[PDB]
């Protein structure tokens, strides 16, 4: 009512309204979905297209070899976070000649979330990141506008995420111990459930990373083949 003027004021219930509004900005963002099996973490997302003359926006981004993210929320904040993570991994590989520990990077970005939530005259980021990597194990992490992070078998962000989450928990048991092709297929079923109005090569993004498989977006021909397999 009057405890949402600033980000430094706890309500009588004891809630930061500004951080909740940043989470609301994440929830109104475009869709995304990630899945992992035993040796592969697949990421996909619906690229926003505001007009037929407009081209699809970039949804999936690459941070480092064997690490990548997906986006849902304010895009400039995602730009800042991407530059920070890219600089952190490249600096680590500079000074130490080894790949960075992924959860240390997740703690670093969560600290950057925290210091902006905490002090006044600054805002929390209106974005959540869907971090996927292979640091000797497939892994899926999450970030929120409050300083916080959790690890998932599968995840979805914004838009009609309820349909995707229902499909994922309906089929979570079969994700482990299946090949990469069926994994990509299941990720496409989850995104098609989020559509509710058709999936095409242009309007969807897809990325794969795993053991002996650096981060590489799927080509147009392979993505068209998988889309035709989903249609059949």
């Amino acid at each position: 009512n009057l405890y949402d003027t600033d980000n430094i004021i706890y309500s009588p219930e004891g809630r930061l309204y500004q951080v909740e509004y940043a989470s609301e900005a994440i929830k109104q963002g475009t869709c995304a979905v990630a899945i992992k099996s035993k040796d592969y973490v697949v990421v996909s997302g619906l690229k926003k297209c505001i007009s037929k003359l407009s081209f699809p926006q970039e949804k999936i981004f690459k941070i480092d070899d064997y690490i990548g993210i997906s986006m849902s929320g304010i895009t400039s904040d995602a730009k800042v976070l991407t530059k920070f993570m890219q600089n952190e991994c490249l600096s680590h590989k500079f000074l130490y000649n080894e790949n960075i520990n992924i959860e240390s990077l997740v703690r670093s970005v969560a600290d950057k979330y925290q210091k902006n939530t905490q002090k006044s005259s600054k805002r929390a980021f209106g974005v959540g990141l869907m971090i996927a990597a292979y640091h000797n194990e497939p892994c899926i992490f999450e970030t929120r506008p409050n300083g916080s992070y959790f690890e998932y078998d599968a995840l979805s962000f914004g838009a009609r995420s309820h349909a995707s989450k229902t499909y994922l928990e309906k089929n979570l048991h079969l994700f482990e111990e299946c090949s990469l092709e069926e994994l990509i297929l299941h990720c496409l079923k989850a995104l098609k459930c989020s559509l509710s109005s058709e999936l095409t090569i242009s309007n969807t993004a897809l990325a794969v990373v795993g053991k002996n498989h650096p981060w590489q977006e799927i080509s147009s021909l392979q993505l068209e083949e998988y889309l035709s397999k989903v249609k059949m």
Binding site: L95, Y96, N97, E98, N101, E103, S104, R107, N136
Partner: protein, 230 residues
């Protein structure tokens, strides 16, 4: 920071089967006085890594606090054994520190060796770590082992045997003559004793009261110091 005052002599590090072997004389000379004849010159950062020392003692002590507390920070943000930092990590860290101090012109009058095991598929010591207080040896491939070097100027490399100080002329010659691969513990200790005997007989700053440390599947083993047979 301005010049050496209290100086250690030299160290030798060699890799063999079941781990690596590093040796050093326990003495720090105040020029031509030999004030201290019982000094711990080989340090430990964690299991599967050690730090050598031949030079000014204050700089080695400062680097010992830095390295061991970097290991403390590693443990404080650890969840699995693979998250433990390798000898390559610490060797690169010391190389960057020496390079930065060179650029600032405030060097460390030391010649460091970092060596250990850069693999975790051989023992389960790091899953539940024991800093304060503390079977059969498992043979270790030489590729999984690592020995490194750091110069005053930050120069660095890796090899199957690394020595510092005056041992870079005597002991390096003996190793290049005689060092084989996958020698047992007895042959390695014989070679180290021969090199240190040659150093004791032709180096004032060295001595016979030797410390010997091993880094194997069981972990870092500070054996009893021994006077050389001569």
């Amino acid at each position: 920071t301005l010049g050496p005052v209290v100086t250690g002599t030299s160290v030798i590090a060699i890799k063999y089967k079941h781990g690596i072997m590093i040796a050093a004389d326990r003495k720090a000379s105040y020029g031509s006085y030999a004030k201290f004849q019982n000094v711990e010159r080989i340090f430990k950062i964690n299991n599967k890594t050690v730090m050598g020392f031949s030079g000014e003692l204050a700089d080695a002590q400062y680097l010992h606090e830095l390295l061991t507390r970097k290991n403390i920070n590693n443990l404080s943000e650890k969840k699995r054994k693979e998250d433990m930092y390798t000898p390559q990590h610490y060797h690169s860290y010391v190389s960057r520190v020496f390079y930065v101090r060179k650029n600032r012109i405030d060097p460390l009058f030391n010649n460091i060796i970092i060596a250990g095991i850069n693999s975790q598929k051989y023992d389960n010591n790091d899953d539940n770590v024991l800093l304060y207080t503390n079977e059969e040896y498992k043979e270790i491939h030489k590729d999984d082992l690592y020995i490194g070097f750091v110069d005053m100027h930050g120069t660095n490399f890796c090899d199957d045997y690394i020595t510092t100080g005056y041992a870079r002329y005597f002991a390096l010659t003996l190793l290049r003559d005689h060092y084989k691969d996958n020698m047992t513990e007895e042959e390695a200790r014989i070679l180290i004793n021969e090199c240190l005997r040659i150093l004791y007989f032709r180096d004032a700053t060295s001595s016979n009261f030797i410390q010997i440390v091993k880094v194997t599947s069981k972990g870092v083993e500070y054996e009893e110091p021994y006077i050389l047979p001569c």
